[PDB]
Design a protein around this ligand. Sequence first.
Ligand code: HEM
Ligand code: HEM
Ligand SMILES: Nc1cccc(C[C@@H]2CNC[C@@H]2Oc2cccc(Oc3ccccc3)c2)n1
Ligand SMILES: Nc1cccc(C[C@@H]2CNC[C@@H]2Oc2cccc(Oc3ccccc3)c2)n1
Ligand SMILES: C[C@H](O)[C@H](O)[C@H]1CNc2nc(N)[nH]c(=O)c2N1
Ligand SMILES: C[C@H](O)[C@H](O)[C@H]1CNc2nc(N)[nH]c(=O)c2N1
Ligand SMILES: [Zn+2]
Lengths: 411, 407
Amino acid sequence: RFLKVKNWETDVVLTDTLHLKSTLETGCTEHICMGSIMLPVRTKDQLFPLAKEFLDQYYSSIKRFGSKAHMDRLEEVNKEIESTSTYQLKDTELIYGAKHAWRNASRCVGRIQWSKLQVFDARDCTTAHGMFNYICNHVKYATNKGNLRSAITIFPQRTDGKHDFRVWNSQLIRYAGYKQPDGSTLGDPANVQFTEICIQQGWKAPRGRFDVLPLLLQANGNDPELFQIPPELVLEVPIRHPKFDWFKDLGLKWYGLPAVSNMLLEIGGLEFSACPFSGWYMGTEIGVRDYCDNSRYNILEEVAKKMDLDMRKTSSLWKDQALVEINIAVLYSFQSDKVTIVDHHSATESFIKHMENEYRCRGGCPADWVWIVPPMSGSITPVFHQEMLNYRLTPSFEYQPDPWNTHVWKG
Amino acid sequence: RFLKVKNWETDVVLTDTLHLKSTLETGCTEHICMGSIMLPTKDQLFPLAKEFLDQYYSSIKRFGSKAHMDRLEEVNKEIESTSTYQLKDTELIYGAKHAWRNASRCVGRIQWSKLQVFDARDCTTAHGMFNYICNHVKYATNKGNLRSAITIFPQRTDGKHDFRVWNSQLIRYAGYKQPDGSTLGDPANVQFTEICIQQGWKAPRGRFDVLPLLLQANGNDPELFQIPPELVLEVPIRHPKFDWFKDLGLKWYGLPAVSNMLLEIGGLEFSACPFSGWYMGTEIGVRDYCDNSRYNILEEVAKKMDLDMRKTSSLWKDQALVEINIAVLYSFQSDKVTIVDHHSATESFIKHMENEYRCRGGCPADWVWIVPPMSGSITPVFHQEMLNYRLTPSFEYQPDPWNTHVW
Ligand code: HEM
Ligand code: HEM
Ligand SMILES: Nc1cccc(C[C@@H]2CNC[C@@H]2Oc2cccc(Oc3ccccc3)c2)n1
Ligand SMILES: Nc1cccc(C[C@@H]2CNC[C@@H]2Oc2cccc(Oc3ccccc3)c2)n1
Ligand SMILES: C[C@H](O)[C@H](O)[C@H]1CNc2nc(N)[nH]c(=O)c2N1
Ligand SMILES: C[C@H](O)[C@H](O)[C@H]1CNc2nc(N)[nH]c(=O)c2N1
Ligand SMILES: [Zn+2]
């Protein structure tokens, strides 16, 4: 079968065949579209087919499909599964797998970069202190004094599900949030529950507006342990505006390294429950979402007050005006400090070129429009006008339950 | 079978059961989501008629009554006899209001029950259609105090006697390709404008030429009519801060009036059913003015603002976008022509969704269309999960008539 997508701005039409290789389910049916829903131990039996499919994909990619080396590797994995119930990936297969999980990530606008991913193999790690060391090295490598480099660190795979490696933090670097008795929040409201966990575990909270959270790390299914990332490894950018001199006095800053730590990486049926990865920011992630969401820092009012905009009616577009100024400030600040960032125009234009190339070379590019379209100025970016097909390919990054809801406390 | 939707800003969860009624298909499957694609006998008619009357009689608390069974008998008799049937005025009005209620791409549905329905089923000629349409235009415009309205022309019969309005909207501006290589006026309407010329229209060849109506009655060749200018309320565009804005020579019309869709009620098909409401400001200021394939004015505006257009990261496009949209709202409000901003409209839609969940068990909504084309995440609809499904009565797309009509 062939499926067409159309760009309504350019009339360019593309043909997708890659969707035929998708097996996992979307949430949608013939009767209902779930495209805007945020969240819509394996047997030996189910494991060898997943391994075989992955290895066939790997061997095809290196132009060795059906070779002696391909056949011998299938036999070796087969033997290992029946004998031990699982298998180990070769370093080459792990690198290919992690790159392809990023390539397949339909909610990621940054995928033009997918083939440049530094993979750190941490499968020999055994303790939380060992995880802390791997993570510091990742942060220092990825930060590169502001010249950011994409990286992922991969801890040992799930065995029986009772010995999981997990980073409890949702991102490696994030700010604390504190609920006050009067109901107001100090710091980042998204991180209140996690901050409470840290405090309970013994973190002495400074109780400010931008306190970098400690890492909470779980090795081998044991209770997690706290660690403070060395401050010299945490690059931060003070936010100021090119024309508005009062902007600095809002006291805003943000960290340079966006690093997702709560997802699960599936490669050939194996499950890597701790696989922190990082790239660099697109400006709207900070200036639109982190700063201006009602349930996040929520700074729109204070900024619009300072700009002296007419705030009595929504129809003066004061919120829209303040939004653009904050986003200009974020890009200006990062660029001035020589910390890698991309604006939403550049990033979406690059994504369209990536997508077109993927269709030609791969037969498709699964993409989730709801997530790819930026959260401001949607239709003046080329992605708004681009039809997309969303489907699930493996290797993949998946969501997993927060570890505090599932962990068995050993005490 | 029961489905939950969460708002990620407020944590409110609603439960959807209304989707189980849904009959038509979405284009998605278990393996692929088509959420962002723009367009994804006698025997057939009685289940469709039945399903409709059942919901009609339920809505007036008379389900299973003698009037209910009687009407079901009467329509059954008429289909068996004539191969079609005729709606009672009450059913037509109900069907039309519900087609709006079921429109998953429409953010303005809080207004669904306040719709003036003009029954034009007695219409026979294109001059007659012109009369009905002028009357609709005048009524809906109401000298700037806009009222929602639909005019319904006779239903499909054998499909060779189709009523159609060839225009995509009742009021739109012409588009012309020039020797220059550029486009004068609205590039979306270039083809339709050509069809107007080839059928006889004398084009002024300006930037904002109100198009003529091309009306097809009873499957005949369509005919041209100029809408009386004094019935077309237009708004000159100016800015409350920038005195130079007015010299861009921009204007828009006050009445948004979709005329190319098909209304389906109880299996009956109404191929000419122009309807109108009032504008949300972004439709004009973001899409009409700033789409690259539309009036595409961002460059000119940014230049007059003297922004740094050297790099994308100065956000010069975004700054100009906001100002253009401020001018749209200010101009309509100053001239007392009804308009809604995207903040107000999306706030209302969330309230409407809550009413629908509470009173009907759900609300079909297409997130891709509901979230405004600028400032998405500062509107509450961005953070609201929505389930998309197709309920009838409905508005449906249909082929452009020039590709289909046999002259
Ligand atoms: C190189 C620069 C990159 C940029 C500019 C970028 C951009 C983005 C953005 C803007 C999002 C949406 C974030 C949100 O709204 O929460 C995202 C999501 C995502 N990206 Fe990237 N990305 C980059 C690198 C990476 C890397 C290195 C990986 C993994 C190897 C990755 C995998 C993902 C995944 C799995 C998501 C979905 C997250 C979720 O569902 O919460 N990206 N990307
Ligand atoms: C009263 C004020 C109204 C407002 C503010 C409003 C708002 C909107 C907006 C912004 C759109 C998206 C338009 C686009 O991007 O092309 C839309 C679509 C739509 N609306 Fe409304 N609407 C209103 C009245 C109506 C009425 C009276 C009807 C029918 C009786 C209706 C039915 C529809 C339909 C069927 C669509 C989808 C059109 C398509 O798929 O092209 N709306 N509405
Ligand atoms: N520029 C880049 C580079 C790499 C990765 C990203 C992803 C960016 C970088 N910070 C966070 C963001 O993803 C999130 C944000 C918030 C929650 C989250 O997890 C979820 C999401 C939905 C439901 C439940 C949990 C993921 N952005
Ligand atoms: N504020 C209101 C009130 C009622 C209706 C509307 C819908 C508003 C009123 N003008 C325009 C808009 O409909 C369009 C315009 C152009 C294309 C379109 O969708 C397509 C796209 C491609 C092919 C076919 C249809 C829909 N907006
Ligand atoms: C309900 C809705 O799906 C949700 O708010 C989504 C919309 N699109 C998004 N897109 C991105 N990139 N990130 C997000 O957090 C969201 N949130
Ligand atoms: C391809 C994509 O579906 C298309 O550009 C859509 C996106 N969302 C939209 N939303 C509205 N309200 N109107 C539109 O025309 C569109 N266009
Ligand atoms: Zn879908």
